[PDB]
DNA sequence: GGATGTATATATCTGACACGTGCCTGGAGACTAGGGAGTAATCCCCTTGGCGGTTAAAACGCGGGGGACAGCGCGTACGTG
């Protein structure tokens, strides 16, 4: 993913781990990026490697 | 025996150089003020990398026909003496 694309409607339920290669200046973009996979109904424990 | 081509010596031209001279303009020395270098603050404009959405402009393909170009004639206007 490019971090600032796709809006808030991207559904990524099947993924488990999120790796942030480049840290954003705005942390809310990173929170939205990790909430792409941490949506309601996720069946796995999500970890983020920065 | 008369006439002809070449070789060293002296007078004259001719630009360049040594010397003379004026004078005026550039250089040496001193002083000063101000123009520019440096510093700090503030705020607006520009840079590089991204995103989203509109949409009008750009790209591509194809028919066809108008125009560029080649060939030929001619007669006149310009070259030449």
GROMACS .gro file of C-alpha atoms (C1' of nucleotides) in nm:
model
  131
    1UNK     CA    1   0.000   0.000   0.000
    2UNK     CA    2   0.084   0.360  -0.046
    3UNK     CA    3  -0.016   0.498   0.292
    4UNK     CA    4  -0.232   0.797   0.197
    5UNK     CA    5  -0.446   0.620  -0.065
    6UNK     CA    6  -0.775   0.434  -0.082
    7UNK     CA    7  -0.970   0.632   0.175
    8UNK     CA    8  -1.131   0.474   0.480
    9UNK     CA    9  -1.319   0.206   0.285
   10UNK     CA   10  -1.042  -0.049   0.225
   11UNK     CA   11  -1.136  -0.389   0.369
   12UNK     CA   12  -0.834  -0.607   0.455
   13UNK     CA   13  -0.981  -0.862   0.697
   14UNK     CA   14  -0.773  -1.160   0.582
   15UNK     CA   15  -0.437  -0.999   0.662
   16UNK     CA   16  -0.267  -1.040   1.000
   17UNK     CA   17   0.057  -0.838   1.015
   18UNK     CA   18   0.116  -0.476   0.911
   19UNK     CA   19   0.467  -0.342   0.844
   20UNK     CA   20   0.515   0.035   0.831
   21UNK     CA   21   0.827   0.086   0.621
   22UNK     CA   22   0.811   0.468   0.619
   23UNK     CA   23   0.681   0.658   0.920
   24UNK     CA   24   0.438   0.938   0.838
   25UNK     CA   25   0.459   1.285   0.988
   26UNK     CA   26   0.089   1.260   1.070
   27UNK     CA   27   0.033   0.966   1.309
   28UNK     CA   28  -0.338   0.949   1.222
   29UNK     CA   29  -0.238   0.827   0.876
   30UNK     CA   30  -0.044   0.545   1.044
   31UNK     CA   31  -0.344   0.470   1.268
   32UNK     CA   32  -0.565   0.448   0.959
   33UNK     CA   33  -0.299   0.229   0.794
   34UNK     CA   34  -0.296  -0.016   1.086
   35UNK     CA   35  -0.677   0.004   1.109
   36UNK     CA   36  -0.699  -0.117   0.749
   37UNK     CA   37  -0.634  -0.462   0.898
   38UNK     CA   38  -0.759  -0.390   1.252
   39UNK     CA   39  -1.126  -0.363   1.160
   40UNK     CA   40  -1.429  -0.490   1.351
   41UNK     CA   41  -1.450  -0.869   1.330
   42UNK     CA   42  -1.081  -0.953   1.285
   43UNK     CA   43  -1.015  -1.314   1.385
   44UNK     CA   44  -0.638  -1.283   1.444
   45UNK     CA   45  -0.406  -1.087   1.672
   46UNK     CA   46  -0.270  -0.799   1.464
   47UNK     CA   47   0.091  -0.685   1.505
   48UNK     CA   48   0.259  -0.387   1.340
   49UNK     CA   49   0.633  -0.374   1.275
   50UNK     CA   50   0.761  -0.019   1.227
   51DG     C1'   51   8.873   4.289  -8.266
   52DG     C1'   52   8.361   4.415  -8.086
   53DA     C1'   53   7.986   4.283  -7.782
   54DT     C1'   54   7.780   4.040  -7.361
   55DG     C1'   55   7.682   3.802  -6.844
   56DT     C1'   56   7.852   3.792  -6.378
   57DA     C1'   57   8.092   3.966  -5.941
   58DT     C1'   58   8.240   4.323  -5.550
   59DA     C1'   59   8.216   4.808  -5.410
   60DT     C1'   60   7.956   5.279  -5.299
   61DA     C1'   61   7.550   5.602  -5.280
   62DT     C1'   62   7.050   5.629  -5.153
   63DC     C1'   63   6.585   5.483  -4.948
   64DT     C1'   64   6.345   5.333  -4.533
   65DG     C1'   65   6.157   5.169  -4.125
   66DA     C1'   66   6.343   5.118  -3.663
   67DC     C1'   67   6.604   5.268  -3.268
   68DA     C1'   68   6.885   5.576  -2.926
   69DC     C1'   69   6.861   6.021  -2.717
   70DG     C1'   70   6.626   6.474  -2.571
   71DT     C1'   71   6.241   6.723  -2.372
   72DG     C1'   72   5.792   6.876  -2.198
   73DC     C1'   73   5.398   6.791  -1.923
   74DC     C1'   74   5.061   6.608  -1.754
   75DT     C1'   75   4.857   6.227  -1.574
   76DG     C1'   76   4.926   5.833  -1.287
   77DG     C1'   77   5.126   5.684  -0.850
   78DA     C1'   78   5.272   5.726  -0.323
   79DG     C1'   79   5.116   5.861   0.135
   80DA     C1'   80   4.760   6.011   0.485
   81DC     C1'   81   4.273   6.069   0.644
   82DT     C1'   82   3.804   5.999   0.675
   83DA     C1'   83   3.324   5.857   0.622
   84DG     C1'   84   3.004   5.559   0.445
   85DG     C1'   85   2.888   5.151   0.180
   86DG     C1'   86   2.868   4.704   0.235
   87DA     C1'   87   2.940   4.272   0.515
   88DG     C1'   88   2.740   4.032   0.903
   89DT     C1'   89   2.344   3.911   1.259
   90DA     C1'   90   1.871   3.837   1.417
   91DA     C1'   91   1.357   3.828   1.356
   92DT     C1'   92   0.926   3.761   1.083
   93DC     C1'   93   0.656   3.602   0.727
   94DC     C1'   94   0.551   3.457   0.263
   95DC     C1'   95   0.692   3.173  -0.144
   96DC     C1'   96   0.907   2.762  -0.339
   97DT     C1'   97   1.062   2.232  -0.332
   98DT     C1'   98   0.979   1.712  -0.342
   99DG     C1'   99   0.700   1.350  -0.276
  100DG     C1'  100   0.235   1.180  -0.252
  101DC     C1'  101  -0.332   1.160  -0.315
  102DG     C1'  102  -0.837   1.229  -0.545
  103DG     C1'  103  -1.154   1.373  -0.922
  104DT     C1'  104  -1.292   1.630  -1.386
  105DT     C1'  105  -1.247   1.662  -1.812
  106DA     C1'  106  -1.079   1.868  -2.205
  107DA     C1'  107  -0.692   1.802  -2.469
  108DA     C1'  108  -0.376   1.475  -2.676
  109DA     C1'  109  -0.295   1.044  -2.922
  110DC     C1'  110  -0.425   0.711  -3.285
  111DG     C1'  111  -0.639   0.530  -3.709
  112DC     C1'  112  -0.821   0.591  -4.174
  113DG     C1'  113  -1.024   0.787  -4.600
  114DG     C1'  114  -0.945   1.117  -4.947
  115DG     C1'  115  -0.836   1.502  -5.194
  116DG     C1'  116  -0.577   1.918  -5.224
  117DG     C1'  117  -0.136   2.061  -5.289
  118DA     C1'  118   0.383   1.987  -5.361
  119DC     C1'  119   0.671   1.857  -5.711
  120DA     C1'  120   0.841   1.698  -6.155
  121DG     C1'  121   0.829   1.742  -6.657
  122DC     C1'  122   0.760   2.015  -7.090
  123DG     C1'  123   0.694   2.419  -7.385
  124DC     C1'  124   0.766   2.911  -7.493
  125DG     C1'  125   0.880   3.354  -7.544
  126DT     C1'  126   1.067   3.716  -7.354
  127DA     C1'  127   1.375   3.954  -7.073
  128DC     C1'  128   1.830   3.973  -6.947
  129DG     C1'  129   2.324   3.862  -7.047
  130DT     C1'  130   2.705   3.976  -7.360
  131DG     C1'  131   2.983   4.209  -7.699
   0.00000   0.00000   0.00000
